[PDB]
């Protein structure tokens, strides 16, 4: 549980926002890329795994599951790569709702930033700090520290 | 001290590696950019602060301390922007040693990657996972969780 993450890919302004969700806390990291390719996905996962103890990634679609470049990054960084089949149909709803929430935040900030990448990082910041009272940023640190101890 | 970070900028291959160090743990985040500008610095700090609870950043030089764009990102993200004067002369030697270690790691991986940005992220991963015994990634999570509790 502390090492499980889910990839998620959503679109805005003709670009692609790639998101990794720490399943047990709801914490996220995200980036803006021109298109989702195996090479962009692989680099994003190398970055994530040098920052958090990533044990498993549920890929966002079959092409990133299949991609030998994505598998090569998961090998390099010690990540178990898995599919993202929603055996719990609850997952489908959680992702869709998260995407709708991020797009709403992005719209509320969009005019403070010239570039979409700035607005997406402002939305990562707001989502991780939001108290729902603990934040997702507090939950992920508590969960992993509990696991280290 | 759980919220205190230090910026650091080093050069390799005609490019700039910008690094944020969590001073109490030694944990790092890093990116490759073509040149250090206040806009690039500001974006990097906005990314960092959406991911960890950044209270204070000691800037790496006077230009990023002065930069109104860097101050605007520190305002947006709720960061106190401070100078990086090594009133403790130990700071100066710790950064130099860190940069030398990162460059050594980058050379040990350099030939597994086409692009420098991949080698830099492999070096972040190796640095943060290295047990010295706990890793910097373990220390930063323990420090902040202890603070939250």
């Amino acid at each position: 549980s502390p090492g499980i993450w889910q990839l998620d890919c959503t679109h805005l302004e003709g670009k692609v926002i790639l998101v990794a969700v720490h399943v047990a806390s709801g914490y996220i990291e995200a980036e803006v890329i021109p298109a989702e390719t195996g090479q962009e996905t692989a680099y994003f996962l190398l970055k994530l795994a040098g920052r958090w103890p990533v044990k498993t990634v549920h890929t966002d679609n079959g092409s990133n599951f299949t991609s030998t470049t994505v598998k090569a990054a998961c090998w390099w960084a010690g990540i178990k790569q898995e599919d993202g089949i929603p055996y719990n149909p609850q997952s489908q709803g959680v992702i869709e709702s998260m995407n709708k929430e991020l797009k709403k935040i992005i719209g509320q900030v969009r005019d403070q930033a010239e570039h979409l990448k700035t607005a997406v990082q402002m939305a990562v910041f707001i989502h991780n700090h939001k108290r729902k009272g603990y934040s997702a940023g507090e939950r992920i640190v508590d969960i992993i520290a509990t696991d280290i101890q | 001290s759980p919220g205190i970070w230090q910026l650091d900028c080093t050069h390799l291959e005609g490019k700039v590696i910008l690094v944020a160090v969590h001073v109490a743990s030694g944990y790092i985040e890093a990116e490759v950019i073509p040149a250090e500008t206040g806009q690039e610095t500001a974006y990097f700090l906005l990314k960092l602060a959406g991911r960890w609870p950044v209270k204070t950043v000691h800037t790496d030089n006077g230009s990023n301390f002065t930069s109104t764009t860097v101050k605007a990102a520190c305002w947006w993200a709720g960061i106190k922007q401070e100078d990086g004067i090594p009133y403790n002369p130990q700071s100066q030697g710790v950064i130099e040693s860190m940069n030398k270690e990162l460059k050594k790691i980058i050379g040990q991986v350099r030939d597994q990657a086409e692009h420098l940005k991949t080698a830099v992220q492999m070096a972040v991963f190796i640095h943060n996972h290295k047990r010295k015994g706990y890793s910097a990634g373990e220390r930063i999570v323990d420090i902040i969780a202890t603070d939250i509790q």
Binding site: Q39, A42, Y43, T68, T69, A72, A73, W76 | Q112, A113, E114, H115, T118
Partner: peptide, 8 residues
């Protein structure tokens, strides 16, 4: 290119 970031 036989590299982790460029398998070709």
């Amino acid at each position: 290119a036989r590299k982790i970031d460029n398998l070709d």
